[PDB]
């Protein structure tokens, strides 16, 4: 149904892979990497 990523939060940066929170973009970027590596059987990167 009509729905998606509303977000609308210009306060820090929250992760979607795990669900954490950050304040410094950089710190938020170096965090999204930890997830970058292995992928679950099924959905592959394109
Ligand atoms: Zn994360």
Swiss-Prot record:
Cite the residue ranges of zinc fingers (C2H2-type).
13-35
Report the domain of life of the source organism.
Answer: Eukaryota
Q: Where in the cell is it found?
A: Nucleus
Q: Which spans are transmembrane here?
A: none
Q: Which family does it belong to?
A: Belongs to the krueppel C2H2-type zinc-finger protein family.
State its role: May be involved in transcriptional regulation.
**Name of the protein:** Zinc finger protein with KRAB and SCAN domains 5
Q: Which organism is it from?
A: Homo sapiens
Q: Upper lineage ranks?
A: Eukaryota, Metazoa, Chordata, Craniata, Vertebrata
Q: Which region of the full protein is contained in this chain?
A: 341 to 373 of 839
